[PDB]
């Protein structure tokens, strides 16, 4: 992901 | 029966002498190389160097032992063996383009040179002046003359051309021989006459050949078709359309059967049925050989892993370009020699080939 | 004949094939490998990067990277290479001759599918494409029109209830907890025995171990006590160098993380509670139909005895008058693709593609209007 | 340096005005009495009826392989292409195996003349036709196509 | 690939129906030995130019002769980027047209690339390997151009990241 | 409005950058490029593929010699570009970093030696027209622009349009006779013996005799010895004797700095004071293929031009390029040429019968204020005129005909 | 070089040379140097009326009118002090250095003289930075014609500064590669946790350009930067101005280096195809060993 | 060998006799498959002694020493060194590589140099590595009978390749960069 978690 | 590779470059044309102990080949350059059979190996005995361009036709007269060579320099030479060396006598062809093929007459009194000047040159001797002179057959021809073969009566002459037509001219020279006898081709035979002209209009004619008795004329086309015109049947044409690549050479091993070769690299056999007037595919003569593989060394493995990151099942690895009859004549042949564009020279045998394949019957 | 291509393109394993078949033509790990050393031998295979099975074979001298992470594409320069290897090397078919059917997990960034469409149209020039949800394709493959799919994909878990073909987009649940997280957890707990796996080439070995020896426990505490009291539950595996390891208690602790994310330090709830909550998110008058049509999917639900554990957990959660029936087909590993080979082959679907000219008119944002 | 004299006498190509150039003959009977080739009405009738093999054979019944008129040749080519590109992909082998050697040597010409002006799916079927016709006739058919002097 | 299989089979079967070449000296000039399909001097040594096409815009034109074959290839070009890349790639192929002995420094007008196989190339080099090279080019050119396109996309992304990182 | 055209004279040992219309090049950098090179295996076209954006991690000019961790490559050898990847990168930093020109608003005037192969011109056109997209290009021969650089230092009323230009640069020495403004191309001479051959000869001399020269600077020293203590001798063996009998005066000392530990080394400059430039009047010293002095080559050049333009060509022999900045070079050249000419004239008079004594041919060698960059200023003239925009190859011409638009130059006919 | 630089090299070189010649005490020589820059800017360093003691550096820009507006010379004046004089006829801005009144530390004035174009741009741009800092909504929004067919629409609000580049490339190859280089420009915000919101559009112009004369059309691309008060504060606005100033030129530069990049891969693939051809040449049976030059071996 | 030949009674001490000792080594010495068994054998029976003739007519007889010289390769504690034997060195080198390639290395061990020409060293190396490697890995010691010249033979293979012309250090490239170019052009 972009915010929260990686991906 | 054997196979011998003289060089890696193509062989333009070859010729044997009377006792089939010497061969004259073209190494794909101006020179003519005469090799001699010494036991089982070949050894070059003579080099004939007089031409300016690469030779395209060699022919060896058996009885007189004179070679004739025509090349792309618009010239012809007659080599005679003086003592130990071949000395050339220049013939004035008077053509303006490259010559293509040469053929001695059966009686060795004249020879025919087909050239790319849309003419045929019938050359003979003038002992009054020691002068090799030539006459021209040029009327119905409209392209290069590719192949020649003489009638057994020393007059008629079969010629294939790039104009899709096979013709039978009359090369009668009234100053070296007598008036010829009437043949089933025609009774009127003046010099330059046209006795027969095929009806094909497709594909060039790479090879023509008269029968052993001079009553049939066969030829091969780039159209893949092999044809035979019979003279005892009102000059009737029997054609056979093959499903392989075209043919380049052919010959008469018997009066009924032909041995052709070409861009397939293996000899095939055809048969003629006179009681029906139709050709039959006698079949492939060569038995497909299994070419042994070789393990690679480390020097060759890396050499062809860096540089480049047999496919053919016959003796020749390139197209076969010329077929000659070694021994037995054209009435009953037993050995025929093939030379192709891979520098090889395959001396075949009819008996061994007929033995290896029992599905192979020679008419 | 000419038929649409179906490319699953999961998070851990890319599966592609032709529509109208019953098995994917090509299946290979979606990884990209690049060498981390310098060749010294002249002319011996000097190429930029290996992809797919070729990378798995030569994994000793490469560093492997996954393009898709948690169901999200995080490296497009590698996803493009993956699709290129799928088109020109695995299927060996031109991309601009067949429509394509891509899959995507639900509740995903819109930029993901927008870039998917942009890549499929601008780069490969496919005449048509479509991006369907994975759970819907799984249900299509199951052969019914009502139920709750629980696609425990390798990269991502998600549940999508469907009733009479009417998906309920307010009851869909997504949990970023799947095969790769279990692989990392196994790598973390294998150190207790003394086996140390750090590099990616070793993570592949750990995945091969997980995919072979791990199993889910019907009752966790019972299995723990049994493994502690008796050495009758240990298994032996041979690494690809001759070494032999023996794993016991670990076997059922790796997949147990699915039912207890607290092991992985997550606040989330197990997949059983996820499915139960996704069911209770629906209106009551259909819940029974879901209780009896729970469908599993994904390569992470292939663990032995997972149907029993799921049924027990849901029966404990759900009321005692509803019939729980965990539909777990023995072919689930490819269901997501199988349904694809069905959906792309239907005759009432050929008007739902995203034609090339539609994209040329309306930009890549048309995927939100066409694809559900 | 450069040339400051007239060199325009080098542009005139006298070789196209030569008198010893090659001219392709044609038969006087083949030049006087032209063959109209196939009857298109019969072909459309046999196609509407729904018989593919008989329409195929009626397309190869007679061909302008002797005329020199471009219109008849183009029309015959169009009709035989209309027959070829409308077969099912399955009945091609059966239609090919129902032809003599000359039938195949002409079908290959009608194939190689259908690649030059293709449509949305004409070539995708002409390639299957070529596959079957080459399986039957071999490279000799392609060579009799190349070395022909009158195109159909 | 497997979508070009019948097209490539037809092209290969037409290639080894031509390429049956022979030595031939010119007719319209004294001693020159020139490829007869390039000079077009004699109309009797020229076979029919056969076209093999997979669709409207991907094709091979084969022009035979007695001592030469000219094979022109019109490659698939889907959009403008593929057109630019195909042009530049064919140009970088022409640049080395003496290492490729069968290549041609300029393509035939309307076609993307052109090979000119005379008879010396079939006498001094393997014929079936030349056929294999032509068919391998036709197999792999689309794949290589697609990889070029992906490389351009990656370059664009890296440039964008290198700019927007400084803010 | 119009912006001034960019002039980029790319020579083997030095490149002169500027905008047309000025008096001197805005930049004179070394023609070198520093790129990251490591120990790899494989071809050169394969190890040049850089992943990511690593192909822009290079420097050119003065900033490429300072870099001690980069590998310095010279793309141009003997005036002929042997490497086109490095040349394209060099050109792109020349345009976008030094000149700061938007290559779509400026006509470009590049240069070339006489015997540049046409494929080099085609590749240059491909680079400037398809990669940089210049609206027009013009590839002029290098020495012909050097003639219009001697007019700024000669008195009014004697600035002629006829003369023999001798351009001796880092990689090539060519002789071009211009008459009335028309390049007599079929008489141009071209010898690949130039400054860098002198620098190799001098370093080989120093390395066979001296000790204490750091290897990594053995070239950098042979340039400071060549462009400082070098002169021309009227006689060779007499100079060897003058150095042998009175070495205490003719043998100099050169003191340099070892740029690793900053210590100082000292060497003795002896015979290489006069043996360096002597490869101009004895080219066999550096390349055993050529054996003809430069005076004889100039005499052949002038004696091949038309007859009635031979006498003015002898009067305005203009030197150009750096390698002609050797003390008393023009003097020895003019002395040898005057010897040859006077001998020929006396022979013609004797053969005539001895009735007329013709006018002695005036021979003059012109050294001027602009020799080091005489080419570039010439370009800065040609690319500042209106007629310039009528002799360039417009972008339309390239888009229509292709790179073959740039295939012809005034050295060969048709 | 990845990022384009803002300082001109010719100005710095010429002025440093003149200042070294003046500081050593040598008599001043004439100077007349005209040149150009990016975006059609034209520089001219000369002497006023043959006065070899004064050097005047003049610059002609494309945003001619936006710099003449009131308040568009605050930065220029602030940075250049007494060097700023009346423009030379035909040019737009002009500095005048007296070679006899040069202050010490001649490096600073030359470092600020090489950035004349950057300072003329930042002077007409900090107006909106201030309009946003002072907490006023609806301040003046304009269109800087920084080129001749492309525009930069600047708008300042209470909480942001919107910059919309309307850009179009001249060559067809450049247009085709620029479509890609601009489509892939939103994928840059994954390289930093703090990057201005970037929006790309070529279907239709944004709603900011519906009351203004910014260049619009069906061949133009629109790139919108939304600079927030963390990119336009009084400490990080220099970098922001540099980047917004050199954005278009940087994109053009990298579009033109993409081709020299692709050429290497094309050469590699050409060699790879040559290696596939090499399987056709029959390996020789015996080769004659030669020398580095190519002459016969002359020995075993 | 010069050291241990004294205990028998022969003393070679000058650098001209070191050649004699080297000839004795490369003609008589060999590697014992099982060191202790061979020691107990040659120390209990005179069936391993060999006689060599010096270049001046003297004949010497060496027994136990024959396999004690090369045995130092497998346990350098004889020479007073701490490092491991050559077999353990090769095994360590293998074990330092990643786990996915070791199986391919075990089956492709290659010997070279003229010091690996001792009779029965391939069998010793195989028997020693097999004791250190897992019981499932197949150990192949590829020792060709042309091992002494192998380093040269590979060179001729390399310098005869086509691409190797692009890996030279051209004299011109050195004339401008000094000796520091070998670290850039050759690893
Ligand atoms: N039989 C199995 N038991 C346990 N885990 C498995 C099994 N088979 C596959 N897996 C794991 O599950 C994942 C396979 O899921 P898959 O169907 O490939 O979905 P995706 O396409 O998202 O990878 C892999 O990460 C694999 O390690
Ligand atoms: N004053 C000088 N004396 C002798 N040689 C010089 C002098 N100046 C330059 N050179 C030599 O000339 C070459 C550079 O001159 P230049 O005209 O720039 O050549 P190019 O233009 O081909 O680079 C160098 O090799 C340098 O050693
Ligand atoms: Mg999946
Ligand atoms: Mg120069």
Author numbering:
A (entry chain l): 1 to 7
B (entry chain C): 1 to 309, 319 to 372
C (entry chain R): 4 to 375
D (entry chain G): 2 to 153
E (entry chain F): 2 to 168
F (entry chain A): 3 to 416
G (entry chain D): 1 to 300
H (entry chain P): 189 to 375
Quote the authors verbatim:
To maximize the number of branches in our sample, therefore increasing the possibility of visualizing the hitherto elusive binding site of cortactin, we used the most active isoform of human Arp2/3 (Arp2/3-C1B-C5L33) and included capping protein in our sample to limit daughter-filament growth. The resulting cryogenic electron microscopy (cryo-EM) structure of cortactin-stabilized Arp2/3 actin branches had an overall resolution of approximately 3.3 Å, allowing us to visualize cortactin. This structure showed that, unexpectedly, cortactin connects the activated Arp2/3 complex and the daughter filament, in contrast to previous proposals suggesting that cortactin binds to the mother filament. No density corresponding to cortactin is observed on the ADP-bound mother filament (consisting of MA1–MA6 in our image-processing scheme). Both mother and daughter filaments adopt canonical ADP-F-actin structures, and Arp2 and Arp3 are also bound to ADP. Cortactin NtA domain residues 21–79 form electrostatic and hydrophobic interactions with all four Arp3 subdomains, as well as contacting ArpC2. At residue 55, the NtA domain turns by approximately 90° on the surface of Arp3 and forms an amphipathic α-helix (residues I55–T76), which binds in a hydrophobic cleft on Arp3 and points towards the daughter filament. Further, the loop within Arp3 (residues 155–164) that follows the hinge helix—which we now term the cortactin loop—makes contacts with the cortactin NtA α-helix through a distinct conformation compared with branch structures in the absence of cortactin. The first cortactin central repeat (residues 80–116) extends longitudinally by approximately 5.5 nm from the C terminus of the NtA α-helix on the daughter filament, bridging across the two successive subunits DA1 and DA3. The interactions between cortactin’s NtA and Arp3 are specific to the activated conformation of Arp3, as computational docking of our NtA structure onto the inactive Arp3 conformation generates structural clashes.
Regulation of the assembly and turnover of branched actin filament networks nucleated by the Arp2/3 complex is essential during many cellular processes, including cell migration and membrane trafficking. The actin-binding protein cortactin, which is considered a class 2 NPF, plays a crucial part in stabilizing actin branches. It interacts with the Arp2/3 complex and actin filaments through its amino-terminal acidic domain (NtA) and 6.5 central unstructured 37-amino-acid repeats, respectively, although the molecular basis of these interactions is unclear. Activation of the Arp2/3 complex involves conformational rearrangement of the complex, resulting in the formation of a short-pitch helical F-actin-like template.
